[PDB]
Amino acid sequence: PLAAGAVILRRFAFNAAEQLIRDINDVASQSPFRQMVTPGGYTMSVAMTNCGHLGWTTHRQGYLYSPIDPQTNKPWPAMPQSFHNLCQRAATAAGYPDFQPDACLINRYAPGAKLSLHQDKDEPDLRAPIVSVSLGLPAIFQFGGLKRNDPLKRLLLEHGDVVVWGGESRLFYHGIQPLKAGFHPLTIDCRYNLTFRQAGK
Ligand SMILES: O=C(O)C(=O)N[C@@H](CSCc1cccc([N+](=O)[O-])c1)C(=O)O
Ligand SMILES: [Fe+3]
């Protein structure tokens, strides 16, 4: 396959998108999007927030999952029903019926925003997949392999696409290329990505 252990489900979230986006807005009304600072001192171009019991954040110049939003000093908003349902349906179709995320990181891309190449290794159990849902403007996703120098492959992720990153692919280096400007009827001028994680012990 494209990436061993990954399951791409194009347009899987297409019908759910309008509701998901309403729920992104609701979460953000409580824990606002913010551009976090990397441990290296750089302000991320991607803006982020979280919902669920745990939320990914930079903290004391490292990263961690925290039950509290350090910007509001309140818990991250509860996981919306629409998020919970979509993630479970996707995980199940992909062969991970027991996947129980307790964190959802919500990434917002304005034109030009990108993610540099990296691995997702902050979770306690790397056998749990990550479920990724793309909404709005299309992005070029790049992913390599288990080594930083593995050859990259590229794939366009479009509105409604869901990828379940399990098995070996769960540990691949990956990133997102600078978002091209455009219009989408539901998000207007941005892309959102939801990544569901099992972050608790
Ligand atoms: O927030 C992040 O760290 C991140 O990368 N977010 C991507 C979606 S998740 C893509 C992903 C997750 C886990 C494994 C692999 N992979 O092996 O390509 C890709 C995004 O904002 O579009
Ligand atoms: Fe990642």
Short mmCIF file of C-alpha atoms and ligand atoms in Angstrom, two decimals:
data_model
loop_
_atom_site.label_atom_id
_atom_site.label_comp_id
_atom_site.label_asym_id
_atom_site.label_seq_id
_atom_site.Cartn_x
_atom_site.Cartn_y
_atom_site.Cartn_z
CA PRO A 1 0.00 0.00 0.00
CA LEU A 2 0.75 3.77 0.07
CA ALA A 3 1.87 3.56 3.71
CA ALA A 4 1.96 0.18 5.51
CA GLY A 5 -0.84 0.14 8.10
CA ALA A 6 -2.51 3.34 6.95
CA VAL A 7 -6.08 3.35 5.74
CA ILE A 8 -7.20 6.24 3.57
CA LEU A 9 -10.97 6.86 3.55
CA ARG A 10 -11.56 9.62 1.00
CA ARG A 11 -14.66 11.77 1.66
CA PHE A 12 -15.54 9.61 4.71
CA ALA A 13 -16.39 12.76 6.70
CA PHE A 14 -17.95 14.64 3.79
CA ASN A 15 -21.54 14.32 5.00
CA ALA A 16 -20.57 15.06 8.61
CA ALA A 17 -18.43 18.09 7.75
CA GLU A 18 -20.92 20.89 8.37
CA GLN A 19 -21.64 19.55 11.86
CA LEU A 20 -17.96 18.94 12.61
CA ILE A 21 -17.19 22.54 11.68
CA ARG A 22 -19.98 23.87 13.87
CA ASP A 23 -18.44 21.83 16.69
CA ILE A 24 -14.93 23.17 15.95
CA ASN A 25 -16.40 26.67 16.36
CA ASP A 26 -18.04 25.68 19.63
CA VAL A 27 -14.83 24.18 21.03
CA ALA A 28 -12.90 27.25 19.97
CA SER A 29 -15.39 29.57 21.66
CA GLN A 30 -14.21 28.03 24.92
CA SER A 31 -10.57 27.17 24.23
CA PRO A 32 -9.54 29.60 21.48
CA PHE A 33 -7.19 28.74 18.67
CA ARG A 34 -3.66 29.87 19.48
CA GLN A 35 -0.30 29.64 17.75
CA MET A 36 1.93 27.77 20.12
CA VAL A 37 5.65 28.28 20.50
CA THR A 38 7.97 25.40 19.71
CA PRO A 39 10.62 24.38 22.23
CA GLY A 40 13.05 26.01 19.75
CA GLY A 41 11.37 29.40 20.16
CA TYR A 42 9.40 29.66 16.93
CA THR A 43 5.76 30.56 16.69
CA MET A 44 3.93 27.79 14.81
CA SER A 45 2.12 28.93 11.67
CA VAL A 46 -0.62 26.40 12.40
CA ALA A 47 -3.10 27.52 15.05
CA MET A 48 -4.32 24.91 17.49
CA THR A 49 -6.80 23.99 20.20
CA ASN A 50 -8.03 20.70 21.71
CA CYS A 51 -11.09 18.93 23.00
CA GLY A 52 -11.48 15.76 25.04
CA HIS A 53 -10.01 14.85 28.39
CA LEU A 54 -6.46 15.62 27.25
CA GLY A 55 -5.09 18.27 24.94
CA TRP A 56 -1.69 18.53 23.32
CA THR A 57 0.23 21.63 24.28
CA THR A 58 3.75 22.94 24.55
CA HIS A 59 4.52 23.40 28.30
CA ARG A 60 7.72 24.51 30.04
CA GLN A 61 9.51 24.34 26.69
CA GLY A 62 8.63 20.71 26.06
CA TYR A 63 5.40 19.08 24.90
CA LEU A 64 2.79 17.26 26.82
CA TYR A 65 -0.79 16.20 27.13
CA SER A 66 -2.63 18.14 29.77
CA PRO A 67 -6.20 17.99 31.05
CA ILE A 68 -6.04 21.78 31.45
CA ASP A 69 -5.79 24.43 28.74
CA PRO A 70 -2.88 26.62 29.86
CA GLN A 71 -4.44 29.63 28.09
CA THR A 72 -7.77 29.51 29.91
CA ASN A 73 -6.72 27.57 33.02
CA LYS A 74 -9.89 25.50 32.49
CA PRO A 75 -10.33 21.95 31.17
CA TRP A 76 -10.34 21.57 27.40
CA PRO A 77 -13.94 21.42 26.11
CA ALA A 78 -15.56 17.99 26.15
CA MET A 79 -15.28 15.85 23.03
CA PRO A 80 -18.25 16.73 20.80
CA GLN A 81 -20.63 13.92 19.85
CA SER A 82 -19.98 14.49 16.15
CA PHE A 83 -16.23 14.07 16.69
CA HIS A 84 -16.63 11.00 18.85
CA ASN A 85 -19.02 9.32 16.39
CA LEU A 86 -17.02 10.06 13.27
CA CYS A 87 -13.74 8.90 14.82
CA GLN A 88 -15.26 5.64 16.05
CA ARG A 89 -16.87 4.91 12.67
CA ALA A 90 -13.58 5.52 10.89
CA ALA A 91 -11.45 3.56 13.36
CA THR A 92 -13.85 0.66 13.18
CA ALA A 93 -13.92 0.56 9.37
CA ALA A 94 -10.12 0.60 9.38
CA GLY A 95 -9.85 -2.34 11.80
CA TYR A 96 -9.35 -0.61 15.15
CA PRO A 97 -12.73 -1.08 16.81
CA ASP A 98 -11.33 -0.63 20.33
CA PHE A 99 -9.73 2.72 19.61
CA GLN A 100 -10.79 5.12 22.31
CA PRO A 101 -9.40 8.56 21.84
CA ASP A 102 -9.21 10.85 24.82
CA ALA A 103 -7.68 13.78 22.97
CA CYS A 104 -8.47 15.59 19.77
CA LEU A 105 -6.03 18.18 18.49
CA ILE A 106 -7.63 20.69 16.17
CA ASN A 107 -5.25 22.34 13.69
CA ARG A 108 -6.28 25.41 11.68
CA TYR A 109 -4.30 26.39 8.57
CA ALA A 110 -4.44 29.87 7.11
CA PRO A 111 -2.83 30.35 3.72
CA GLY A 112 0.88 29.62 3.99
CA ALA A 113 0.64 27.64 7.21
CA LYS A 114 2.56 24.36 7.31
CA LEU A 115 3.81 21.59 9.55
CA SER A 116 7.47 20.72 9.43
CA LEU A 117 8.53 17.10 9.11
CA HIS A 118 8.09 15.23 12.39
CA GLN A 119 6.97 12.07 14.15
CA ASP A 120 4.01 11.75 16.54
CA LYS A 121 5.72 10.02 19.46
CA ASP A 122 4.23 11.86 22.47
CA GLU A 123 1.60 9.20 23.27
CA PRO A 124 2.19 6.40 25.86
CA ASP A 125 0.97 3.62 23.55
CA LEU A 126 2.21 3.83 19.97
CA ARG A 127 0.16 0.76 19.06
CA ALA A 128 -2.95 2.97 19.12
CA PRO A 129 -3.62 4.60 15.74
CA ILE A 130 -4.23 8.25 15.08
CA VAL A 131 -7.37 9.20 13.14
CA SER A 132 -6.95 12.30 10.98
CA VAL A 133 -9.89 14.25 9.49
CA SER A 134 -9.40 16.99 6.88
CA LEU A 135 -11.95 19.78 6.37
CA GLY A 136 -11.95 22.76 4.03
CA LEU A 137 -9.10 23.72 1.73
CA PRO A 138 -6.93 20.94 0.29
CA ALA A 139 -3.39 20.35 1.63
CA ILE A 140 -0.40 18.42 0.35
CA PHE A 141 0.53 15.86 2.99
CA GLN A 142 4.04 14.45 2.84
CA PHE A 143 5.17 11.32 4.62
CA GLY A 144 8.32 9.28 4.59
CA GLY A 145 9.24 6.34 6.75
CA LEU A 146 10.71 5.48 10.13
CA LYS A 147 13.97 7.35 9.37
CA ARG A 148 14.14 11.15 8.95
CA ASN A 149 15.87 10.56 5.60
CA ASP A 150 13.41 8.10 4.10
CA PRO A 151 12.15 9.24 0.68
CA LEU A 152 9.01 11.33 0.94
CA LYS A 153 5.70 10.59 -0.73
CA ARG A 154 3.02 13.18 -1.25
CA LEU A 155 -0.72 13.03 -1.19
CA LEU A 156 -3.44 15.62 -1.48
CA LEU A 157 -5.89 15.55 1.43
CA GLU A 158 -9.21 17.10 0.54
CA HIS A 159 -12.36 18.14 2.37
CA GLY A 160 -13.89 15.19 4.15
CA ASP A 161 -10.94 12.84 3.79
CA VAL A 162 -10.03 10.70 6.77
CA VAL A 163 -6.85 8.73 7.26
CA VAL A 164 -6.36 6.11 9.95
CA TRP A 165 -2.64 5.96 10.70
CA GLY A 166 -1.99 2.57 12.28
CA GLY A 167 0.68 -0.11 12.27
CA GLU A 168 4.01 1.03 10.85
CA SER A 169 2.65 4.23 9.36
CA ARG A 170 1.80 5.42 12.88
CA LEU A 171 5.53 6.13 13.30
CA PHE A 172 6.35 7.69 9.93
CA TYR A 173 7.84 11.16 9.63
CA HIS A 174 5.25 13.44 8.07
CA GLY A 175 4.33 17.05 7.47
CA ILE A 176 2.05 19.42 5.60
CA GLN A 177 3.24 21.74 2.85
CA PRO A 178 2.32 25.46 2.90
CA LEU A 179 -1.43 25.78 2.44
CA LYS A 180 -2.51 27.25 -0.90
CA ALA A 181 -5.04 30.08 -0.63
CA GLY A 182 -8.53 29.47 -1.92
CA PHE A 183 -12.21 29.23 -1.14
CA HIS A 184 -14.20 26.49 0.47
CA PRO A 185 -17.92 26.96 1.07
CA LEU A 186 -17.85 25.59 4.60
CA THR A 187 -14.56 26.91 6.04
CA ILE A 188 -14.28 29.95 3.79
CA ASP A 189 -10.48 30.45 3.68
CA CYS A 190 -8.83 27.77 5.81
CA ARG A 191 -8.21 24.09 6.38
CA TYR A 192 -8.94 22.30 9.64
CA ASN A 193 -7.54 18.97 10.64
CA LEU A 194 -8.71 16.91 13.59
CA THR A 195 -6.31 14.32 14.98
CA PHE A 196 -7.78 11.87 17.46
CA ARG A 197 -5.29 10.28 19.86
CA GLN A 198 -5.18 7.88 22.77
CA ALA A 199 -3.03 10.06 24.97
CA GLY A 200 -3.72 8.65 28.43
CA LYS A 201 -1.65 5.86 30.01
O1 LIG B 1 -0.81 17.47 14.46
C1 LIG B 1 0.04 16.80 13.84
O2 LIG B 1 1.10 16.43 14.41
C2 LIG B 1 -0.19 16.45 12.40
O3 LIG B 1 0.67 15.84 11.78
N1 LIG B 1 -1.35 16.89 11.89
C3 LIG B 1 -1.70 16.62 10.48
C4 LIG B 1 -2.66 15.41 10.51
S1 LIG B 1 -2.10 13.81 11.28
C5 LIG B 1 -0.95 13.01 10.15
C6 LIG B 1 -0.34 11.86 10.69
C7 LIG B 1 -0.51 11.42 12.01
C8 LIG B 1 0.17 10.27 12.46
C9 LIG B 1 1.03 9.56 11.61
C10 LIG B 1 1.20 10.01 10.30
N2 LIG B 1 1.98 9.46 9.36
O4 LIG B 1 2.66 8.41 9.60
O5 LIG B 1 2.00 10.09 8.08
C11 LIG B 1 0.52 11.15 9.87
C12 LIG B 1 -2.48 17.86 9.98
O6 LIG B 1 -2.59 18.86 10.73
O7 LIG B 1 -3.00 17.79 8.86
FE FE B 2 1.87 14.78 13.25
#
